[PDB]
């Protein structure tokens, strides 16, 4: 397992106004000393949650959600991890939410292999036009302005060579379900 890069992807926590904490079964998995980078879609919404992320990994990347208190977070970011250029945006900018053509234009504009967005509180992990799209969902299962019964989720990317293995963690009541999706750069 040496030479892998593990990247946590999460957001739409909405602590403390909608939720008080990540779920206990998620905190049991999210332990220090494993994850190298964190890419957060935003909506923390306060420093308490940022400080929590810093306990998991030193390298924490956040973009500005519509409800974040911290107006210094950037609107969007592009990072390179391994062979992959990765875009990050919270996604309230996309109307209607999750709109494929909108996201595909961002992919082009950012010039990224993988585009990460949030806002919908619905996980996504799929390939379109040989690019990869991720949405980690809401790690706390916070409601959104359209939806009340949200499954908590987060994502972990395992990046090695020209492959990313994307793990999706979902809390179904209080049992965890994991899914794996592989993407290989063309």
């Amino acid at each position: 397992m040496a030479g892998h890069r593990l990247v946590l992807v999460l957001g739409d926590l909405h602590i403390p106004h909608r939720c008080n904490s990540l779920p206990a079964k998620f905190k049991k998995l999210l332990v220090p000393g494993k994850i190298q980078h964190i890419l957060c879609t935003g909506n923390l919404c306060t420093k308490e949650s940022y400080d929590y992320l810093k306990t998991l990994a030193g390298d924490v990347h956040i973009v500005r959600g519509d409800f974040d208190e911290n107006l210094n977070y950037p609107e969007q970011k592009v990072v390179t991890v391994g062979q992959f250029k990765i875009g990050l945006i919270h996604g309230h900018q996309v109307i209607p939410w999750g709109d494929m053509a909108s996201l595909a234009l961002l992919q082009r504009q950012f010039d990224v292999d993988i585009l990460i967005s949030g806002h919908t509180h619905k996980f996504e992990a799929f390939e379109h036009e040989n690019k990869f799209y991720i949405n980690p969902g809401s790690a706390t299962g916070a409601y959104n302005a359209l939806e009340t019964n949200i499954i908590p989720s987060f994502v972990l990317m395992d990046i090695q060579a020209s492959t990313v293995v994307t793990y999706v963690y979902q809390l179904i009541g209080d049992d965890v379900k994991v899914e794996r999706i592989e993407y290989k750069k063309p």
Binding site: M1, A2, K34, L156, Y167, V176, V178, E179, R180
Partner: peptide, 24 residues
């Protein structure tokens, strides 16, 4: 293929990732 065991955050004894982190 049980992804509860086979994922990088697995806390399962049998997990290869778990084994990897144990070595420190």
């Amino acid at each position: 293929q049980d992804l509860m065991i086979n994922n990088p955050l697995s806390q399962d004894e049998g997990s290869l990732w778990n084994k990897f982190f144990q070595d420190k």
